[PDB]
Amino acid sequence: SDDRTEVPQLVNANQYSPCVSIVPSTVWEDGDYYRKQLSPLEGGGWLVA
C-alpha cells in the first residue's frame, strides 16, 4: 500500500499460486500482465501477475 514495495508471492507445496485468480486458464499472448486492487482487509495495495 506504499506504492513501491514489491513482494513476490511464492507458491507453497501442495498449493496453487495466489495469482491463479487473475491469470486465465490459458494465457492469450506471451507477456500479458494481470492486476487486481486489494481490499484494505486483504492488505491493500495490488496483486500483480
Added chain:
Amino acid sequence: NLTKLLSLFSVNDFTCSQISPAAIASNCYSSLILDYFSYPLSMKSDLSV
C-alpha cells in the same frame, strides 16, 4: 521531504500521470527528476500531459 518543500509555496494545482500525489510522496524510487520554471496560473490549461 517533499511535503516540506510544498509547505514553503502556496500550491494551486497537483495532477499526476500513472501515479497520484498521495503515492508520489510515499514511494521510494531509483531516480527522481525535478524540473522547475516560472509559469503563470492563467496558462494552466496548456500545462497538461
